[PDB]
């Protein structure tokens, strides 16, 4: 069980809304990202890809405002981090979101 899989279990089927580890509301998502970035020193690729999926679910829902806030909040925490892996994780999230934006949405 990855970080978010364990958070999902302590939060039963998948909500239909964009969700990270079962969290739909923005403040719940925000607290999850905070705990992930500030307590984990070696993030799992599986958790990074669940963030990618949360982001492209927001695009599919046309919730570009919530996406903007989520990216910017993650950018702040991940680049405040002492560990260089979080900088790479943030780059990786942006890169993969843009592959989906470009190929699916023409952007």
What is the C-alpha to C-alpha distance for residues 60 and 82, in angstroms, rounded to an integer?
33
d(Cα 66, Cα 68) in Å, to the nearest integer? Answer: 5
d(CA 8, CA 31): 13
Q: Tell me the residue range of the domain where 76 lies.
A: 1-107
* Beta-carbon contacts of residue 65 (< 8 Å; ≥ 6 apart): none
As a whole number of Å, the CA-based R_g of the chain is 13
Can you read off the two tokens belonging to residue 16? 């239909």
Element of type H or E holding 77: helix 64-80
* Technique used: X-ray
Give the Cα separation of 39 and 53 in Å (integer).
Answer: 22
Distance from the Cα of residue 86 to its chain's centroid:
12
**Residues 21, 58: Cα–Cα separation, whole Å:** 14
In angstroms, rounded to a whole number, what is the distance separating the alpha carbons of residues 65 and 79?
21
Number of domains in the chain: 1
- Lookup result for tokens 């699916």: 104
In whole angstroms, what is the distance from residue 19 CA to residue 83 CA? 26
Q: What is the domain-level CATH number for residue 25?
A: 1.20.58.1280
Residues 4, 22 contacting (CB under 8 angstroms): no
Q: Which residues contact 1 (CB under 8 A, 6 or more apart)?
A: 9
φ/ψ bin of 42: left (φ > 0), alpha (ψ from -120 to 50), beta (otherwise): beta
């Amino acid at each position: 069980k990855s970080f978010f899989d364990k958070k999902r279990s302590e939060r039963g089927f998948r909500p239909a809304a964009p969700n990270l580890a079962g969290a739909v509301e923005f403040s719940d998502v925000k607290t999850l990202l905070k705990e992930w970035i500030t307590t984990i020193s070696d993030p799992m690729e599986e958790d990074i890809l669940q963030v990618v999926r949360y982001c492209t679910d927001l695009i599919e829902e046309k919730d570009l405002e919530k996406l903007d806030l989520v990216i910017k909040y993650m950018k702040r925490l991940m680049q405040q981090s002492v560990e260089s892996v979080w900088n790479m994780a943030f780059d990786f999230i942006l890169d993969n979101v843009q592959v989906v934006l470009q190929q699916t949405y023409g952007s």
